[PDB]
Design a protein around this motif. Structure first.
Motif, PDB file in Angstrom:
ATOM      1  N   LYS A 203      28.216   1.692  34.400  1.00 24.86           N
ATOM      2  CA  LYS A 203      29.904   1.605  34.544  1.00 24.86           C
ATOM      3  C   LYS A 203      30.662   2.764  34.442  1.00 24.86           C
ATOM      4  CE  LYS A 203      28.560   3.814  29.351  1.00 24.86           C
ATOM      5  NZ  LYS A 203      29.626   4.071  28.566  1.00 24.86           N
TER       6      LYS A 203
ATOM      7  N   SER B  99      24.702   1.827  32.449  1.00 26.77           N
ATOM      8  CA  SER B  99      24.685   1.559  31.378  1.00 26.77           C
ATOM      9  C   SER B  99      23.561   1.218  30.597  1.00 26.77           C
ATOM     10  CB  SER B  99      25.336  -0.181  32.042  1.00 26.77           C
ATOM     11  OG  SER B  99      23.963  -1.026  32.330  1.00 26.77           O
ATOM     12  N   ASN B 100      23.464   1.205  29.102  1.00 24.58           N
ATOM     13  CA  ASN B 100      22.114   1.429  29.001  1.00 24.58           C
ATOM     14  C   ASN B 100      21.469   0.125  29.182  1.00 24.58           C
ATOM     15  OD1 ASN B 100      21.424   1.818  25.980  1.00 24.58           O
ATOM     16  ND2 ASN B 100      23.512   1.534  24.971  1.00 24.58           N
TER      17      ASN B 100
HETATM   18  C1  LIG Z   1      28.699  -0.396  26.833  1.00 22.33           C
HETATM   19 AS1  LIG Z   1      26.941   0.099  28.077  1.00 22.33          AS
HETATM   20  C2  LIG Z   1      26.362  -1.281  28.755  1.00 22.33           C
HETATM   21  O1  LIG Z   1      26.704   1.537  28.110  1.00 22.33           O
HETATM   22  O2  LIG Z   1      25.891  -0.035  26.224  1.00 22.33           O
END
Ligand SMILES: C[As](C)(=O)[O-]
Ligand SMILES: CC1(C)S[C@@H]2[C@H](NC(=O)Cc3ccccc3)C(=O)N2[C@H]1C(=O)O
Ligand SMILES: CC1(C)S[C@@H]2[C@H](NC(=O)Cc3ccccc3)C(=O)N2[C@H]1C(=O)O
Lengths: 137, 137
Positions: free
Chosen positions: A78, A86-87
């Motif tokens: 991201k 990203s997560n």
């Molecule tokens: C907005 As994210 C994919 O870092 O939980």
């Protein structure tokens, strides 16, 4: 003396083969090339500009930007603009570290910490210079 | 995590070596009309004459890929079909050793050969264990 250079190439080849083998299933689950997987591991170490990744990946700037763009389309990475995992990219890297650390500590269990430390110091100096050379022309 | 720190550093070190090499050899590759990956298959073949299957599972990659790179190398006359190098491929590998040698040499000429060698010793066992582990898969 040059055979040291050859050995390092053999060693790198073997590390890569092992990794490719140990990470086969995982990379299929995520449907990611070792090419793509490498950049994530790369960003796992620290954030990075999109211009900076181009310098710490070396090959065509264009090749690396596409791969980053590809990891964005997969939502594995991201923005800020900085590029971070990203997560979802993070969960992938935990599973990757899980596996690699498992076998790595198996293979060095009979090694005394201070042997590894001194070997690591010499490689850090070399990693340092490699980066400085890379930095220049 | 102690070890996990050592894998990250090892992962970063390997990526830096590959990035340097690519930058250092871009023109030679271009002069011989090949890509980085083709040049890779070429260095492996310098290790020994391997067959297609061997280079596929080693690098750990998909079907068409390796074969495709090998078809291009054989059309550029750097290989000789088994699969072996040719006078021209052998010439390329030589030119590559020279470049990598001057560079490795001038980046390590202040070290103790006793220092470089205890390092090589520790890595040879890890290469040996990596290699014996890869046999089990
Ligand atoms: C907005 As994210 C994919 O870092 O939980
Ligand atoms: C500049 C590049 C290093 S990046 C560009 C493109 N990269 C790809 O991966 C092609 C592709 C696009 C979408 C899905 C799969 C493959 C492609 O191929 N590429 C290279 C080029 O043509 O020089
Ligand atoms: C798995 C790889 C062999 S592919 C990536 C890139 N490949 C190359 O062929 C670069 C190269 C140039 C000159 C000599 C050897 C390899 C390189 O370096 N590579 C390894 C990697 O870390 O993925």
């Amino acid at each position: 003396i040059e055979d040291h250079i050859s050995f390092l190439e053999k060693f790198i080849n073997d590390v890569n083969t092992l990794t490719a083998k140990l990470l086969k299933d995982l990379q299929t689950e995520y449907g990611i090339s070792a090419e793509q997987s490498h950049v994530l591991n790369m960003l796992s170490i620290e954030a990075l500009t999109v211009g900076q990744i181009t310098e710490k990946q070396g090959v065509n700037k264009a090749a690396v930007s596409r791969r980053v763009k590809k990891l964005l389309n997969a939502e594995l990475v991201k923005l800020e603009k900085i590029i971070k995992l990203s997560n979802k990219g993070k969960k992938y890297i935990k599973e990757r570290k899980a596996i690699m650390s498992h076998i790595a500590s198996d293979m060095t269990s009979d090694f005394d910490s201070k042997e590894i430390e001194k070997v690591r110091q010499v490689l850090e100096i070399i990693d340092y210079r490699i980066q400085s050379y890379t930095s220049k022309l």
